[model samples]
Target: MPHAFKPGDLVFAKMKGYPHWPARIDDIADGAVKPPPNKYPIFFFGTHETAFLGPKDLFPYDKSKDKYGKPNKRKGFNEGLWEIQNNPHASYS
Candidate 1:
């Protein structure tokens, strides 16, 4: 997640979307790990099932959900963060 993101952004619970789930997964393959444009605000996001998102996008991830709405794969204190800008600082520290 972004250095500025909240714990909410990190995949803490067993959600239902993205390429990881199906929590049956681990070090989930990018094939299963949904791609988010390679861009930001996007810099931060939780791997939640996005079960919250409901079938949006091209389903960039594999079956975040399995035949059952349970853990197909999983992750821990992960928040997918990035900095499109050259530096997080404004001028200098």
Candidate 2:
């Protein structure tokens, strides 16, 4: 069985469809499974939703701050914080 992960705990997960890329765990579900759809042990990652990936694709990496040391802006899918999908060539695995 996979080990339980916690917030800020560095972990590695495998992407479902995109087997070439990796992801990082961003958050873990806690408390009773939510209503509508009960899905316990839910893990959230910092990957693109279209990528169809999850915490399973997360990998342990040093969380570094941007060189500019400025707060990231919440912009469109192709800008700011959402720019993670820009360079798909940058291998995470």
> Can you write out model 1's per-residue Cα lDDT over 58-81, one digit (the tens) per residue?
122223223323332335213221
What TM-score would you give candidate 1 relative to the actual structure? 0.15
Q: Score each candidate by Cα lDDT.
A: 0.25, 0.33
Candidate 1: global Cα-lDDT? 0.25
Stretches of candidate 2 exceeding 4 Å from the true structure? 1-3, 28-47, 50-93
**Per-residue C-alpha lDDT of model 2 across residues 1-93, encoded as one tens digit per residue:** 446544434333344542222223333337633423221232322343322234434544333223221333322222322223344223332
Q: How does residue 14 of candidate 1 score in lDDT?
A: 30
Pairs that collide in candidate 2 are 12-58, 13-56, 13-57, 13-58, 14-56, 14-57, 23-57, 23-58
Q: How close is every model to the real structure, measured as TM-score?
A: 0.15, 0.26
